[PDB]
Every structure is written in structure tokens, then in C-alpha cells.
Design a protein around this ligand. Sequence first.
Ligand SMILES: [Mg+2]
Ligand SMILES: [Mg+2]
Ligand SMILES: [Mg+2]
Lengths: 206, 244, 405, 30, 137, 178, 170
Amino acid sequence: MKLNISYPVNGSQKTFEIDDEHRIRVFFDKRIGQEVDGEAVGDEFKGYVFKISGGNDKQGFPMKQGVLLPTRIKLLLTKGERKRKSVRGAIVGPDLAVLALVIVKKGEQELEGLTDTTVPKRLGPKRANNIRKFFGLSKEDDVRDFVIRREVTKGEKTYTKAPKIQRLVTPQRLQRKRHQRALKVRNAQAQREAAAEYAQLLAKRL
Amino acid sequence: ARGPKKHLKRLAAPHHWLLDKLSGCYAPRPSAGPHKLRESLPLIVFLRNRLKYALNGREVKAILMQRHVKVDGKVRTDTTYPAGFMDVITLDATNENFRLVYDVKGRFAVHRITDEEASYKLGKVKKVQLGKKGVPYVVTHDGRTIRYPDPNIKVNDTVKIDLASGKITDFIKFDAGKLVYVTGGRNLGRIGTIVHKERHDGGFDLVHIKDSLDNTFVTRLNNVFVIGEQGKPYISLPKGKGIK
Amino acid sequence: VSVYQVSGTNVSRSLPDWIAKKRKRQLKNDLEYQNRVELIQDFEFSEASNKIKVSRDGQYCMATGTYKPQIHVYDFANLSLKFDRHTDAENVDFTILSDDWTKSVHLQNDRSIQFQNKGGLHYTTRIPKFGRSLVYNKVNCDLYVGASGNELYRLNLEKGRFLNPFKLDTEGVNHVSINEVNGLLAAGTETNVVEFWDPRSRSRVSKLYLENNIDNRPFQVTTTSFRNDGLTFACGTSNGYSYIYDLRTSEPSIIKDQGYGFDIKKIIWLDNVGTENKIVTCDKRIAKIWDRLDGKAYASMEPSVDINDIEHVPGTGMFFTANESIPMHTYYIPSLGPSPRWCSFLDSITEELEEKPVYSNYRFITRDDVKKLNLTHLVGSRVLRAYMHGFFINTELYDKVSLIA
Amino acid sequence: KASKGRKLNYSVQDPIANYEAPITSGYKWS
Amino acid sequence: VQSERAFQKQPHIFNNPKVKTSKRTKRWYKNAGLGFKTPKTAIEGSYIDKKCPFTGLVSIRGKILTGTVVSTKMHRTIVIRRAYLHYIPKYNRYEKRHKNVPVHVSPAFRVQVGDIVTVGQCRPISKTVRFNVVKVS
Amino acid sequence: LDDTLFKDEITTFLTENGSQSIKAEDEKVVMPYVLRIFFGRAQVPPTSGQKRSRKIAVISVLPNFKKPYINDFLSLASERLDYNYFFGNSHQINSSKATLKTIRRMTGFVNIVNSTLSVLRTNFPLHTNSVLQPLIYSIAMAYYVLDTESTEEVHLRKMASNLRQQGLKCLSSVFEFV
Amino acid sequence: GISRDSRHKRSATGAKRAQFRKKRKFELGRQPANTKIGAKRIHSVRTRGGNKKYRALRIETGNFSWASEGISKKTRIAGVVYHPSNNELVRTNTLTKAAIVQIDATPFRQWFEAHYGQTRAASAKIESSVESQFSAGRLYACISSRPGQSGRCDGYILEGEELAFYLRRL
RNA sequence: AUACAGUGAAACUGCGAAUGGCUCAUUAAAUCAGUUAUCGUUUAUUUGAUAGUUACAUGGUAUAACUGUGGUAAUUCUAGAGCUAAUACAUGCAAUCUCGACCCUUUGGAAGAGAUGUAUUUAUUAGGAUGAUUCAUAAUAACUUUUCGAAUCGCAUGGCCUUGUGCUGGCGAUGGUUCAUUCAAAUUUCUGCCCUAUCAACUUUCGAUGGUAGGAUAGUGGCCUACCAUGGUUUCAACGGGUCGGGUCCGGAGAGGGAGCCUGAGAAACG
Ligand SMILES: [Mg+2]
Ligand SMILES: [Mg+2]
Ligand SMILES: [Mg+2]
């Protein structure tokens, strides 16, 4: 079966075709969430540890956690209403076309396509506190200087694009909060004045 | 139907709008608002079929959102906003002030008024009651809930509301000899003086009204709107002074 | 012996389940949430579950709910909910006439018998007085309904005819049960007597008077059950005492005390599993397994929430229990027998299972009952091992003091 | 009295007629 | 009066067992209006009737009708008969028609067969009772 | 500790004669923690109906305790207050102690006592060191701050007037019950 | 599938009215809630409009009010003892309005001994039957809030003619 | 435009999809026409009133579009990785008013005394409006898996100064608690042109009539359950039989079969 391996720390991923049945056997009878030792799989994976994460069978039906069968079943899967759809059992078996794995720990030798390479994070922080956490900025430092900027070159033109910071403290928000509080105070004063005038009207009438 | 209606077929519309039959298949449905559906004149009809300033719905819509209209001193932007009895419509650009009062025929009259009288309106105090925190209030016929009213005010009285501030400048008690306007029944649009109010406990009261000509008629109390003291109406009346 | 909780809430008895749902979002990160295995999807009711039974064919199960009163039917071949069906009033008891789930009869609490066919509610009929239990005689197609009043109603499915109701000497029938081998019906009256009836005729073959020496208190027969051997017979009492009778002799062969003073809710005969001499006597709080000959305790199931019904999948070591909890519990005692065919790999994960384990072994006594028995002087002694608000005494020593007292 | 079924009615009821058929074998013991 | 499984009391009226000022249990009553006098037996009675128009949670509003009592067998409720004349145009003549209206009657009224009673409308008290006996003569 | 289960847990765990109540042999070890756990809840601001409900609950569970335990709880309230010097000397205030912080702690203490009196009423256990002499010292603080402080310290003065109003009310109550 | 339509009933004259229309939503009724003593379990119901209803499927605690002293305390419910409509509700510990239940007497005893300093005398005097109930440890109270609808089971401790009548009925 | 800033595919949020249209099989007070009430109820929206009781602004307890790796014959089929946001989802914070000595000044200052959300449920106390209330409203004691009481956005940059970007701010939008108003909905009072006795009994034969308690309801109500009383209509025609409504408009009913569920203010939804 094909093994779709992923290294999340680098963000890399690659597929290895397997024809020998014996590493496939050490994969057998395991369950999603268990761990296996790479060396049994092959000397290249010696020292690695793989966590199984899913896969698809020869008819294209995915695998689901929690079901203790090696055979397909029609299960009432959600995303309120839930369809009844086919799903492969969670037990690895010979009927699996592709098995997905996540590398928990690195072994001795480096894989060509997964450990050696990296894929940078596509997007960076946008909320102010997330920027602070990313750069560990102190409260006195302003995030406005440390915003991630990405360069865009179209022909001979070049410009830097940066995201809009959300939940940033600006004079406008202070102004708005001040306005809300002042509005509340003004309303209370207006009601008090009306009540006093009403009492005076009744006093005149009496 | 299984829910609210949102259309109004032309023939089913209130007759007093005078909508052209050959115009089309529907008519403007007044949106929910201060005045009931059958007793209301949407701004679209008033601007288009009555004043003729706009030639179609689109032009009325443009007029409204230019913020040239003020209903009861406030700018409104809904084409089917339901203007009704004693509602002040102000067009500052043309410098026109209109008060919606029925004529003798029973249809809303295009009644121009000066500014100083346009500053205020009248409201029949349908309900009087204590609100939360023991704050007395009055419900007028156009929906405006006025708090801290004058104690003497009771049901069926009239209150003169200053449009700018929304407060009661003065009021008129319901009593014999008072000048009254009919807002319902077959005598709609007639003006007269109260003579006797027949009281039928738990039933619909009746009021006897004598016009200037000394003709007399009887109308249900719900349809009576005190407008002032005899010979001294607090508003300008349309032409004819509600006779016949 | 080893008892594993395959499914069921694993929180403290004091902690209710609904907060665990609220904790669920917070604890999504926790690894155990991924690792936990649910055997049947949605194997759970909104608030509580009342009764649970397994179809004879062995692939389908049916259950009843509290609100909205509903009727799940689970498909073992797919480990999933097949269909949920609402009802008018909450269920008190039912049976599955057919070998599959298709054909069933449900005695609700509003005095109405509802006949559920595969498509939907077929027909609803009403018995004259409130019902308490319901049994079906396969031989005559005559459905027998216990009632609050003395008379025990008879409904004939073949003829579609109410027939002449049996008349009992006493009022109130708590459970009814039909011996398969012989057709003997046993009716559990409110008073401490069980009246036996012949179905082919309409007569009273005899009435057995239950006698408990330990406690002078009045007690009600709450459950009955005939073993497949066609000779032995079990009784429950409202005092938490389970009797095993050989029908021929009037004397109780064995009397076992559950010791919590709670009414016995069901008796199940574990003859099919192999090593036939075992029996389950299920209480509000505990379901004990013990051997019919010696009276020695074999295993105990101590769920964190009240038990309303317990069911044993035939030929296997599995047990379902309808509880007052949101989920219905599933237990698996490997020693009894193999895991069911549909749970073929349940053995594989035995080590990952919870493996829950004194409380069944001893007899529980309240503080007040200690005063009644004048055992206050032993409070703090190694004889009285205090738990919760009461004290535990050896069953033998309890029998001794009670007679003296 | 008879209302609400409190008096037992022994008429045929069509929907439940022939709901299940009796087994011809009978009791296993003779 | 406590002739039933449940204790009949005017809801939310409280008699303080600690104080015990007066033997007379507190009793609440209201005037129905329309110039209709509340009888003194209702004021000083001891019955408990949730549907009594003078001591119960019911309001008289709507039509007021009159009729002649025809039957009183039902408990606290009676059957009145109203008669009128219907005009047949084909014969240009009139024929006497009747309709039976059941009504509720409070125990504070004593009503016999044949007397003339004025009833008032009230909220639906039962499958067919929509009125309340309010004056007997 | 959980906010959602707190009300139910109190009525099930601490109610006298309750099924899950602590056993007599185990009262000594457990109750010190229970007093500390409930003490924190007593420092919630009662800004909302539910929070008001919570504050009444913590004071409403007190009578379930035995009298020696109740005395301990009052001691925990007064541990933070420093009063021994005052009665040690000729009833004189230290100017250093005269701060807003002390008054704020003082108002917290007096507020606990007024709540506790209302629940326990005549059963309230009164001890000179645990309750009374902190209470008197707090009123003693109030007069000192009000006379000594100048007018510009309006907020500190108001915290003083509040302390006096509660303090004198507290004395009026404590005589009345006991 | 419960309905409140008046069409399926017979007319006053006895005519069997015919089916006019299929069942509608604005004539809905839902399955009853058999409140029982046990760990608090409540299921919410989305009713007509934005309003919401709570079904007290199970509950063990409730606010009970001593009217004579005008006090309210939260107490545990021991069990249902008598229910005016039916007794098979009394048997299964079913909780519903007008039910007579036994509540723990602890907090009221504590409040009494605190407020009056007794286990002056004239005010402390209480009905003999209530005092006997205190000595027993449980008090008879009547549930005054609809468990099915609001979701709470508050009520009041019996007293006076209430107490005499119900004790007789017991 | 060194946080973004013009325009903007994609996606997440919000609002709407119960209007409109089309066919007439059914049914003779069933709908329906007029007429009456809701002191017996729910109501998106509009309109008008209405909440002083870490903060120079919290978390991922977070994912979409998107980057990349695959399975399958295969779909508006799919699993494994990697991101990132809110009006999405969670969490959350030094004032006013009375009585007012001193009667000091007689508007006035003022020692001191006090008092201080909303919502659910129950218990208890007080009681301007209608013919009439256990109405409106207020108070006390507790209760709540219990709320709500701006961590929001556009445009503009004024007034002060104690020059810190210190304090104080203009016009709007979107929200939110309760009441009223409007659009509605649901029940409901009375009146209402066929032939009929060769249709004289009908209901009570799984509520018929009524009381009381409960359950359900948005509520009244046999609407449904328990117990109890034996009633209710009819020769003035009950019961039964035969023969779309009203005035293009207004109403009524209906769109694989039957059973069950789902959201929403409104549907047993043409989903
Ligand atoms: Mg919508
Ligand atoms: Mg608004
Ligand atoms: Mg009722």
C-alpha cells in the first residue's frame, strides 16, 4: 500500500509506495492513534516513530476513528441533520489502498523529501496579541513596527503588503468608549431632570 | 396563508388613494408604522399621485434618500412609510409643510400650512398608565409613548405635541361644547361640536355632534378626535370647514 | 475477576454527565478523548433510558427514552443507530414479538398498549387499568398485561380479541413471567405472595407465600423469572432479597441479600453462557453475578448511575444497562465467555479498557438501622467498616444480630 | 364508565386481527 | 365544602395560622359591574368556586343575554332556553324558534326550573359553557 | 471551586445530616480546607443577581458548621487586620497603619461580619479576639481617619465614612443578637 | 403527535365531525414530563416565539416557603407522599403541582433556633403538628410551581386547615 | 499611506426563502358572510419611550477560503498535513438621591443620619386605570445548569489646557432589556332561504354532558389524564339521505406513498 507520510514540524509530506508485505504486516492490526516503530517498516525509517492518522481503501472510502472493525459500515456521520454514509473501519487491514502517517519523532537517518525540506507558514499573525506572542514583545513595544510584510513584485513595480491589525488600541476606540460612557451619564442626568420637573409640577398642583 | 401578507392588489387598496387602474397589477403596501394600514397614506402615493413631484417610484425613492422629506420633524427614507392623520410632512427645498386631514369627501387632503403651526401636532391620548419604576405615561394615537404627562390628562383627551422635543405643550379635555373631528364611520371628515355622550357600559359609546349648520349626527366614540374649542380650532382646517 | 466498562460515563458519581458535555469542548485537546472508543454510535438518550432488550436473532437492539419519549433501534451489524421514533407517553415495558426488530408491543404509562410495526405505529389500544408489566405467550399468541387491580388482563393477538381476564386474589401485579418449558405464568402480587396460573386452562395451580425471617418488614414481589430448565424459579422482593425456588418444594433453596435495601429490578439467568450455574440479580445501584448452587459472589457491576434495566446478550459475556444517565453503559466480563461476533476485536483492546473492579461482598446498613439493631457500641470496631452514610457488616453477622434483635 | 376503555370490551379489533399466528408445535414438554 | 381529594381554597389568599385574629377565614370577592349587585351570600358564604363570577378568576365581558331556566341537573351548571320568532318569507309568516344555551351558575345563586335568568359572557369554561349566570329573577 | 456546581455541591456536601456530609472523624482534617475554599468565594464583588446569590450562599452554609469551626472562619477574616498593637498600648492608632489599604481590608472584614450575623443571628459565636476587638479597632480607625485627614482626600474620607456606617451598624446588630 | 384540536371531538348535538384539515403547528402539544426525584436533569424546549421552556425531568432540590414566618429556604425533597389527581403518581415518586412531598427540616429548624433562640415564648409558639413534624425530621409541603413548565419545584410548607385536611387524607 | 486605507473574485458571518403563482377532488353552519371578545393569548419588522450599580481592550478553548500530499470508476465524494480573521464562537471591568441640625445665610450653603439594577420561579405585603380584577406598579425572602446591563464599525479632528499625543469630543451605522404601537396569527360571542319523517331517535360502544386536581398549550378549554355526578340534543325536526364559497376581487383546501423528526417570529414547510 502507499504510505502518505507527513512531518508537521517542517510541514512536509510525501508518499512512499510499498510492495513488500512485511512492513505492511507490522502495520496490520493497529488502530488510529497508536504508534509504530519505523525500523520494522524499513531501515531508512530506523529510529523514527509513526502515528497512524487515517487512510483510504481500494474503493475510496475513508477511515474513521472509534469504530472497531476491519470492514466497511454505513454510519450516521455528521458534517444538525446527519447523512448515513459508508466508512471503512478504524483497524488497519490488507484492504487499504493508502495509509496516512504523522512523524512523531525523528530517527537516525534523514528522509530526502520530509526532514530535509521545509514549507513556510502561508500566513502570519493578524490579531495584535498574536503578534505579541509571536515576537514576545513587551507591553511598551508597539506591534506596529513588527508586522509581517510580504513583498510583491509585478514587472518593475514592487510593494510590500501587510495585514490590518485587529483589536489594536487606537485613539478612535478610546474616543468611542468615552462617548458611550458620556452618553450613559447624559441620559441619567436627563431622566433625573425630568423626574424633578414632574415632582415640581405635582407640587404646584397640590 | 400561513404567514403575513406582503403584497397588496390594486383593487383591494383603500379607495381614497385613487390609484389608476391601468397603471398595473399591484399597489404600494404601507409598511408597519404609526398608523394602521387602511388609515394610512404611504409617502410614495403622497409624493407621486397627489403632489405629482415624481413621475414614478424610482424618482420618489431618489427624493426620499436625498433627505428632502421630514415626517414629524424626522427624516425618513422608506417609500411605503405610512403617514396618517395629523402627520406633518415638511419639504424644505420647496418650502412646503403639509398636514394630513380628511376632507368632507373622506379622502386625505393636500393641506399646506405655515411653519409656526408646522412646529407641532395633535394626538388623541388613547391610553394612560403607569410604566416601569412608577413613571406615568400616555399612549397617543400615533404610537408615541409620552412619559411624565400632566395628571389631569385622561383617556380620549387631546395633547398638543411639540415636534422638536416630543413633549406635551397643552391639552384639551373631552367635554360637551368642544370642537371635534370625525376619523371613522360614514361621517368621516366632518367637523362639529359635542352635545351629548351616550354612555353604554361595556359597549361602544356614542357621541352626538352638531355642525355649524345645526344638523346633528351620532358617531362612535372611537372615531371622535377633539381638535379644539368651538370657534377656536388649534389647527388650520381645510377649505370648507368640514361641512356636509 | 475482571470487569471492563466498554461504554459508559467515567466521571464521579457526584459529577453529573451534562457538565462533562460542557467540559467536552474544553478537553478536546486531551489525548484520552481521541483514544476513548465508543462501541455503538449515539448509544445514548437525551436524559435517561428506561428499558433495554436484545432481539432474538442477535443483530438488533431496542431501547426506550425519557424525553422526548422515543424508541431507538440499534443495528449491531453497522454499530449505528438505525432509526429513532417518538411516542405519545413514556414507556413502562415492552417486548419484541418478532425475531427481528420489526414487530413489537409497548405498554406505555398512560394505560395504552401501542403496537409498533416496522413501518410505524400500527394500532393503539387501552387496558381498563394502569399497567405494570407485559409478557407474550408464543404458544397461544395471548399477551398478558399486569394491572393495578386484581384482574390480570388477557389480549389475544391471533383473534384480535380481549378474552376473559384472569382474576387474582390480591390487588396489584408488579411483574409477570412465562415459563418457556411449561407455560406456567407467575404473577408477582403486591403482597408477599406469587400466584401461579395455568395458561391452557384458566386456574390457580398454587400460590407461594414468601417468608423472610431476617426482616419483619412487609415486602413486595417486584420481579420473577423462570429458568430454561423448566423447574427453577426466581423471585425479587422490595427488601432487596432474591430467592431461588425449585417449583416442586415450597422452601426457598437459597436466599441472597443484596444488602442495600433496594427493590430488585430484574433477574437474568446466565445458563446460555456456559457453566450454567450463575444468575444476575440487578438492583437500583448494583448488578451482582453469583452462582445458583453455592450463593458465592462471582462478579459485580457497580455503575456510577442508577440502573433501570440490565440485559445480557445471549451466548456472550456482554451486558447492557439502561441508566438514569445520558449514555447507556456496556460492560464486558471476559471470564464468562467470548466477545460477541460483531465485537470481534473487543478482546484486542482489553488492556486499553477501563477495567473497573468490597461493596458487593458485604451488606450495607444505614445509621438508623444500626440503632435499631443496638450495634452502636461497635461503631469504630473492625466489624463495622463505615462507608458513605452507613456501615458494612458481614452478611452472616447481620443475620445473627437481626434475629437476636 | 365504558368511556376511556375502563370497561373491558370484547369485540374483534380489525387492525390487530391476525397480528401473529400461533405456533402449531405447542409446549416443548408433552 | 372540602368534599374532594384536594383542598379547595381561593388561590393566593392567605390566612395566617400564627396570628389567629379572627375566626372568619379571609374571603376575597369582587363587584362584577354593569350595575349588577353582588349577592350577600357570596360575600359571606363559605363555598370555593374558581368559576364563580363574584369570587372566582373569571371576568364578565361581551354580550349580556336573558333566558328561562329549563334544566338544573348538572353540577353548578344549568341549561337555559332562549326563544324568538323566525320570519319565513315564502309564507310571509313567523314561526317560534328556540335554542338551548348551557351556562355556569355559582352556588351563591339558587335557581329553579322555569325562572328567568340574565347571564353574561365569559371565557370558555368548558366544551359548551361560555356564559355565567349573573342575575336571577 | 467550580462555579456551575457550587450551589448543588454546598447543599449536598455540607448540609447537616446530609448523606454525603463529612464524617465526624474526618471533620478535623477537612474543615480547614473548606473554610479556606469558602473564604475566597466570599471576596467576589456582588455586582449581579447570580453573584449576589453566590455571596449569600457562602454565608448561608455557615450554620451547618460546628461552633469551633465557625469561630475559626471569623479568625481567618481578622488575620489580615492588625489590631494587637492598639489594645496593647493605650488604645492609640499608628499613623503608618492609617491608609486606604487598611480601610479597604477593614470594610471587607466588617462586611463579612454583618452578613454572618444576619444568618446566625442569636446563634452567632462571639469571641473577644476573633471578632469583637477587630470590630472595635475598625470603628477606632474610622474616627481617627475622619478627624486627621484633610478635605482633599475625598475618596479616602468616603471609604472612612462607609467603614463607620457599617461598623456602628455592626455593633447595633451584635448586641441585638447576642 | 399530540394535538389540542377541537375538531376530532363530537359536537354538542352528538354529530361526528369530519376531518377538515391536516394537523397544524399552532395546535401543538408535547409529551408530558414525568418529573422524578433524582440528580437534576432538565431539557429545554423551544416554544412558540422566542420564549423558552424548561422541563424538569428530574430534580431533588427546591425552594420552599414558610408563610407564617415569611421565610424561604432551599431544601431537599425526600419523596412524594400524596398527590390529589392520582396515586400511581404517589407510588413512582412523580413530582407535579399540588403534590404533597416530604422535605428535609434542617434549614428551617436552624432558622427558627437562630431567630428566636429556642428549640419571647409567645412569639416562638408554633402549631403542635408542625413541631411534631420537626421532631420527626421531615416536613409536609405542597409544590406550587409547575415542574413541567418553569423547570423549578418551589412550594410551601403546609399549615393550618391545609395540614389538618391532608394529614386526615394520609 | 510602514498597521490597513482605492476596487475586489473566494469564504465566514447577517437578512430572506411561510410572499407570489397554479388546480378545484372534497365537504351543506364544516368552512363561510355579517357581528363580538381576548380581564384568555404569541408577534420577525416599523415607530416611540427605555438599562450610572488585562480594560490605552482576553482566548483559540479556531476554523473557512487558501498552500501542499493522496485514494477512488466516481458525483455539489473524500482522508492526512500546514495557516489566518469577526458584530462568528467563548470570557470579561473615587457616583447619585432623600431627611436634613448649624436655622449659620432666611433662593442658599451645610454637621450627621440614611437609601440605592434588570430577567426566571415561587411565597408574602401594598394597590393610578377600566363597568369590573389576584390589573398597572411597588416591596420583602429566597431560587435559577438563567439571563441582559456595547472587548463592534464609517466619516470628521473640534475645545481645552495642567505639551503629554494629557484631558475633554461631533454626525451616523450595527446592536440590546422591558412596555406601548404596527404588520399579523389563534381561538371566540350572536344572527344567517334547498328538499326532506317513504330519516325518529342520537350521544353515551375506547368523553358523551358537568365538577374538581394535574399534564400540554402561546394561552382559555375534556384538549388529554385521575376521581367523582349522570347527564346533553330532538317531532319548534336532533340524527340520517339527495342535490368549492362569497362578492376579476376576497376567502377555503391541495402538490412519490404512509410513519417519524429538524429550524424559524411565522411551516406539521414545494427545504
Ligand atoms: Mg428568516
Ligand atoms: Mg426600537
Ligand atoms: Mg385545568
